[PDB]
Amino acid sequence: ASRLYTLVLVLQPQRVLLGMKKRGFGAGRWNGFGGKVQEGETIEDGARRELQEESGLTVDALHKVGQIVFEFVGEPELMDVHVFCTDSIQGTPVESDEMRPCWFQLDQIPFKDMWPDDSYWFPLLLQKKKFHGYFKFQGQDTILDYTLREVDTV
């Protein structure tokens, strides 16, 4: 029914790292770093791998902060997105043809140029909350319906 994805937010006390994707799913929006989990890889190892592949950063310590299921009406496959945070990174963000990382101060997060669900759950991530979410989209711009709940265990 659902396909596993990861999403990693590099969140420091006064700034967050976002990446502008060049092509494919979500091109032209700022987002965290992530993608599909591979065969024989754990969700957390997938999250670490996608952070390096897309940002050039090395993370050791990840922690789980959320699980969000996305439905696109007319598309059979649900996206089961496992969301992680770190403050604890090595390396310099790498701009590549696929991805342009930038730091944002926490009061200048570019919500109008992000997926619209981020306006709902990012405020929970910034206050160190953990959450379970479901968003039903019509195409890439319109949230038809959603649920979002804070939890003590992701």
mmCIF file of C-alpha atoms in Angstrom:
data_model
loop_
_atom_site.group_PDB
_atom_site.id
_atom_site.type_symbol
_atom_site.label_atom_id
_atom_site.label_comp_id
_atom_site.label_asym_id
_atom_site.label_seq_id
_atom_site.Cartn_x
_atom_site.Cartn_y
_atom_site.Cartn_z
ATOM 1 C CA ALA A 1 0.000 0.000 0.000
ATOM 2 C CA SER A 2 2.830 2.418 0.938
ATOM 3 C CA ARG A 3 6.434 3.103 -0.101
ATOM 4 C CA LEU A 4 9.130 4.124 2.500
ATOM 5 C CA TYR A 5 10.851 7.504 2.251
ATOM 6 C CA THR A 6 13.075 9.551 4.570
ATOM 7 C CA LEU A 7 13.225 13.256 5.243
ATOM 8 C CA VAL A 8 16.084 14.790 7.249
ATOM 9 C CA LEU A 9 16.097 18.310 8.754
ATOM 10 C CA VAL A 10 19.490 19.695 9.869
ATOM 11 C CA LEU A 11 18.175 21.932 12.663
ATOM 12 C CA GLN A 12 20.596 24.048 14.765
ATOM 13 C CA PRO A 13 19.573 26.396 17.602
ATOM 14 C CA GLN A 14 19.227 29.460 15.257
ATOM 15 C CA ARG A 15 19.070 28.078 11.679
ATOM 16 C CA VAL A 16 17.922 25.140 9.509
ATOM 17 C CA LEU A 17 19.468 23.743 6.308
ATOM 18 C CA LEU A 18 17.028 23.296 3.368
ATOM 19 C CA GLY A 19 17.751 22.162 -0.190
ATOM 20 C CA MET A 20 16.199 23.457 -3.468
ATOM 21 C CA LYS A 21 15.744 20.393 -5.794
ATOM 22 C CA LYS A 22 16.520 20.944 -9.541
ATOM 23 C CA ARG A 23 14.475 18.041 -11.070
ATOM 24 C CA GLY A 24 11.816 15.432 -10.377
ATOM 25 C CA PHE A 25 9.403 15.249 -7.420
ATOM 26 C CA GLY A 26 9.185 18.687 -5.750
ATOM 27 C CA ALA A 27 11.593 20.541 -8.081
ATOM 28 C CA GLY A 28 11.607 24.297 -7.357
ATOM 29 C CA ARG A 29 10.703 23.925 -3.645
ATOM 30 C CA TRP A 30 12.915 24.183 -0.553
ATOM 31 C CA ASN A 31 12.713 20.937 1.495
ATOM 32 C CA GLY A 32 14.678 18.669 3.769
ATOM 33 C CA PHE A 33 16.965 15.957 2.386
ATOM 34 C CA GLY A 34 15.682 12.462 1.650
ATOM 35 C CA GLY A 35 14.358 9.847 -0.724
ATOM 36 C CA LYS A 36 13.435 6.177 -1.107
ATOM 37 C CA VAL A 37 14.734 3.529 1.305
ATOM 38 C CA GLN A 38 16.606 0.721 -0.459
ATOM 39 C CA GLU A 39 16.357 -3.073 -0.253
ATOM 40 C CA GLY A 40 18.296 -4.409 2.794
ATOM 41 C CA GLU A 41 18.803 -0.914 4.304
ATOM 42 C CA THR A 42 17.174 0.292 7.551
ATOM 43 C CA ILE A 43 15.088 3.496 7.453
ATOM 44 C CA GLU A 44 17.710 5.333 9.554
ATOM 45 C CA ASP A 45 20.597 4.149 7.339
ATOM 46 C CA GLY A 46 18.568 5.394 4.317
ATOM 47 C CA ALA A 47 18.100 8.772 5.972
ATOM 48 C CA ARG A 48 21.877 9.102 6.621
ATOM 49 C CA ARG A 49 22.724 8.019 3.031
ATOM 50 C CA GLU A 50 20.244 10.488 1.447
ATOM 51 C CA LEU A 51 21.535 13.345 3.633
ATOM 52 C CA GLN A 52 25.135 12.675 2.301
ATOM 53 C CA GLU A 53 24.006 12.110 -1.314
ATOM 54 C CA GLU A 54 21.950 15.348 -1.509
ATOM 55 C CA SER A 55 23.752 17.737 0.918
ATOM 56 C CA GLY A 56 27.361 16.381 1.147
ATOM 57 C CA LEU A 57 27.028 16.396 4.967
ATOM 58 C CA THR A 58 27.982 13.477 7.215
ATOM 59 C CA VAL A 59 25.560 12.773 10.134
ATOM 60 C CA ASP A 60 26.213 10.098 12.813
ATOM 61 C CA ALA A 61 23.441 10.849 15.367
ATOM 62 C CA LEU A 62 19.910 11.108 13.792
ATOM 63 C CA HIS A 63 16.738 11.123 15.824
ATOM 64 C CA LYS A 64 13.241 10.249 14.701
ATOM 65 C CA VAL A 65 10.830 13.193 14.966
ATOM 66 C CA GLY A 66 7.862 12.265 12.773
ATOM 67 C CA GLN A 67 6.044 9.919 10.460
ATOM 68 C CA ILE A 68 3.834 11.479 7.733
ATOM 69 C CA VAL A 69 1.774 9.543 5.186
ATOM 70 C CA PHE A 70 1.018 11.369 1.912
ATOM 71 C CA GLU A 71 -1.819 10.518 -0.465
ATOM 72 C CA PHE A 72 -1.976 12.080 -3.939
ATOM 73 C CA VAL A 73 -5.549 11.562 -5.213
ATOM 74 C CA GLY A 74 -5.528 9.384 -8.339
ATOM 75 C CA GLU A 75 -2.092 7.853 -7.447
ATOM 76 C CA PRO A 76 -2.244 4.389 -5.872
ATOM 77 C CA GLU A 77 0.962 4.450 -3.823
ATOM 78 C CA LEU A 78 0.994 6.235 -0.423
ATOM 79 C CA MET A 79 4.283 7.840 0.625
ATOM 80 C CA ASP A 80 5.244 6.777 4.177
ATOM 81 C CA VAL A 81 7.780 9.470 5.128
ATOM 82 C CA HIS A 82 10.010 8.947 8.187
ATOM 83 C CA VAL A 83 11.243 12.352 9.384
ATOM 84 C CA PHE A 84 14.537 12.780 11.261
ATOM 85 C CA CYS A 85 16.408 15.727 12.831
ATOM 86 C CA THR A 86 20.070 16.302 13.665
ATOM 87 C CA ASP A 87 22.022 19.360 15.057
ATOM 88 C CA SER A 88 25.281 17.326 14.833
ATOM 89 C CA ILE A 89 26.923 17.239 11.414
ATOM 90 C CA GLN A 90 30.332 17.223 9.692
ATOM 91 C CA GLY A 91 31.249 18.731 6.324
ATOM 92 C CA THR A 92 30.202 21.809 4.330
ATOM 93 C CA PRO A 93 26.916 21.711 2.355
ATOM 94 C CA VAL A 94 27.668 20.826 -1.318
ATOM 95 C CA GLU A 95 25.722 22.492 -4.139
ATOM 96 C CA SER A 96 25.241 20.019 -7.006
ATOM 97 C CA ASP A 97 23.374 20.034 -10.277
ATOM 98 C CA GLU A 98 20.523 18.142 -8.442
ATOM 99 C CA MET A 99 20.350 20.120 -5.198
ATOM 100 C CA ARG A 100 21.140 23.671 -3.845
ATOM 101 C CA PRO A 101 21.489 23.753 -0.010
ATOM 102 C CA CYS A 102 21.040 26.992 1.942
ATOM 103 C CA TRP A 103 20.855 27.910 5.646
ATOM 104 C CA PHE A 104 17.777 29.819 6.846
ATOM 105 C CA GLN A 105 17.344 31.708 10.100
ATOM 106 C CA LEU A 106 14.366 30.226 11.948
ATOM 107 C CA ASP A 107 12.260 33.374 11.485
ATOM 108 C CA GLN A 108 12.952 33.419 7.654
ATOM 109 C CA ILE A 109 11.879 29.864 6.748
ATOM 110 C CA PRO A 110 10.510 30.183 3.160
ATOM 111 C CA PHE A 111 7.123 28.488 3.739
ATOM 112 C CA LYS A 112 5.546 29.986 0.522
ATOM 113 C CA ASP A 113 8.300 28.150 -1.515
ATOM 114 C CA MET A 114 8.010 24.858 0.425
ATOM 115 C CA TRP A 115 5.518 21.974 0.252
ATOM 116 C CA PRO A 116 2.355 23.259 1.859
ATOM 117 C CA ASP A 117 2.277 20.565 4.571
ATOM 118 C CA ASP A 118 5.494 22.038 6.052
ATOM 119 C CA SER A 119 3.444 25.057 7.325
ATOM 120 C CA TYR A 120 1.560 22.553 9.527
ATOM 121 C CA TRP A 121 4.301 20.340 10.982
ATOM 122 C CA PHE A 122 7.486 22.450 10.816
ATOM 123 C CA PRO A 123 6.304 24.610 13.783
ATOM 124 C CA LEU A 124 6.115 21.325 15.792
ATOM 125 C CA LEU A 125 9.632 20.295 14.698
ATOM 126 C CA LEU A 126 11.010 23.736 15.725
ATOM 127 C CA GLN A 127 9.509 23.312 19.251
ATOM 128 C CA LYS A 128 11.122 19.777 19.542
ATOM 129 C CA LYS A 129 7.795 17.965 19.275
ATOM 130 C CA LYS A 130 7.261 14.536 17.648
ATOM 131 C CA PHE A 131 4.272 13.939 15.359
ATOM 132 C CA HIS A 132 2.222 11.546 13.223
ATOM 133 C CA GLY A 133 0.584 13.075 10.153
ATOM 134 C CA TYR A 134 -1.530 12.270 7.093
ATOM 135 C CA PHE A 135 -1.966 14.699 4.195
ATOM 136 C CA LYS A 136 -4.279 14.141 1.207
ATOM 137 C CA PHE A 137 -3.172 16.254 -1.770
ATOM 138 C CA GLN A 138 -4.739 17.155 -5.092
ATOM 139 C CA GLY A 139 -1.723 17.552 -7.301
ATOM 140 C CA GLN A 140 1.249 19.273 -5.658
ATOM 141 C CA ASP A 141 -0.355 22.530 -4.378
ATOM 142 C CA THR A 142 -3.665 21.691 -2.636
ATOM 143 C CA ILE A 143 -4.179 19.944 0.738
ATOM 144 C CA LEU A 144 -7.711 18.495 0.586
ATOM 145 C CA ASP A 145 -7.641 16.971 4.111
ATOM 146 C CA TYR A 146 -5.116 16.192 6.846
ATOM 147 C CA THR A 147 -4.583 14.877 10.331
ATOM 148 C CA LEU A 148 -1.672 15.794 12.549
ATOM 149 C CA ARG A 149 -1.113 14.649 16.158
ATOM 150 C CA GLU A 150 1.803 15.142 18.590
ATOM 151 C CA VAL A 151 3.101 11.849 20.083
ATOM 152 C CA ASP A 152 5.703 10.876 22.676
ATOM 153 C CA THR A 153 7.011 7.926 20.569
ATOM 154 C CA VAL A 154 7.348 8.170 16.712
#
